């Protein structure tokens, strides 16, 4: 259960990840989208603030990847990228499971 | 990142998940281990307390999954299952990255 | 599986020792003993490695670490390289087996 | 250091591994080749024990394939692979010619 801003921020971080793994710099349009524009439930289900907390993490991870890159700091760059990647897999998984619409349909009548 | 109590609790929850997914009940020793015994970092790396928050989330998801198998509510016994599965993949991925030993070795001499 | 906690500790220490021995350093006395560890059934029916097989190769690695050190003092350059190559290949093997055994993502089935 | 029997059994086990990763069967000629006939370095008996282990894993993998046990098949495959990588690294190190040569004069 993402909100629109969160889905837009997530997809922006997934694109930022791909460019950073290809050494590329980030367009300022993308840099800002990466940054964007109660915390724990009773069941254990994730909450909107939990989602925003992880997306804010990702934004900071991205700042760290670029700083490590631009200083040639290599192994630290990869530990950040692997943390980012694991977060994005997690958020992408939750986003798809809740937004998916085929699985709401029964068999043909 | 992970301490040993947490690694142990994660493993028990993974094992609990597999039994619950194949409709079994949980042994007493596993029902105990899945319970065990701020939150944000400046760089975005997950923190011990974030890890423990999700492990507690998972224990409450496991309690709800066990109930909906005695409450007959088949449908939400699977949204809980899918939330627990995605959490376990995430924690397992972080735990495997930290504990990995082959990455600590250089290339051949 | 087959790794116990003492072996995982001995294997980390040997990996640490390996690098120090590759960057010319000597090993502190603490680490020289962490590499020995503390203190039959060597083959299994299926071929899976056994605890005793792991322990024998960790002990071999300790002897290799000792041959490496001694031959670094005596500058035996060509001795040192063959020992280092054997140690490296053992540590990669033990590290791969330890990782596979401890790996927790592979324990999880497909999404529901 | 390997002997020629071991090198031949190792190459056959490397071949057998690839075919099994493709669900294919093993010609009897390969199956038989896969079976064969203080300082810390590896010894020839240690080499043979691991080649013997690999034959036993291959039997377990084939049996786990035929009987459809997929999770078990891949755990043996992972163990056989790690053994093969290890024996191959050692055999390649001992036999490698180019690393013996200095830089151009």
């Amino acid at each position: 259960s993402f909100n629109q801003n969160q889905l837009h921020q997530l997809r922006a971080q997934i694109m930022a990840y791909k460019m950073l793994a290809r050494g590329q710099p980030l367009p300022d349009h993308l840099q800002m989208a990466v940054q964007g524009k109660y915390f724990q439930s009773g069941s254990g289900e994730i909450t909107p603030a939990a989602i925003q907390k992880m997306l804010d993490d990702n934004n900071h991870l991205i700042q760290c990847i670029m700083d490590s890159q631009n200083k040639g700091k290599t192994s630290e760059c990869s530990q950040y990228q692997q943390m980012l990647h694991t977060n994005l897999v997690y958020l992408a998984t939750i986003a798809d499971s809740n937004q998916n619409m085929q699985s709401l349909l029964p068999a043909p009548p």
Side-chain angles (χ1 to χ4, degrees), chain A residues 11-80:
Chain A
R11 166 178 292 105
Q13 291 170 349
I14 290 167
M15 167 139 54
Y17 179 90
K18 278 150 79 154
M19 305 201 63
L20 285 179
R22 305 191 318 258
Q24 293 180 249
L26 302 182
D28 173 69
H29 181 51
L30 178 53
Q31 173 66 82
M32 294 307 117
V34 152
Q35 295 169 334
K37 319 299 198 294
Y38 194 34
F39 179 64
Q40 178 158 35
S41 72
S43 59
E45 180 181 30
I46 208 188
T47 68
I51 293 167
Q52 193 61 53
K53 177 263 179 169
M54 184 152 337
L55 297 153
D56 291 332
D57 291 345
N58 290 350
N59 164 38
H60 305 141
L61 290 167
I62 288 167
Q63 307 326 123
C64 288
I65 284 140
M66 301 182 298
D67 186 61
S68 307
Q69 283 192 320
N70 311 344
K71 297 186 187 159
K73 302 220 255 191
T74 289
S75 83
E76 52 291 31
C77 180
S78 293
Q79 281 187 126
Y80 287 142

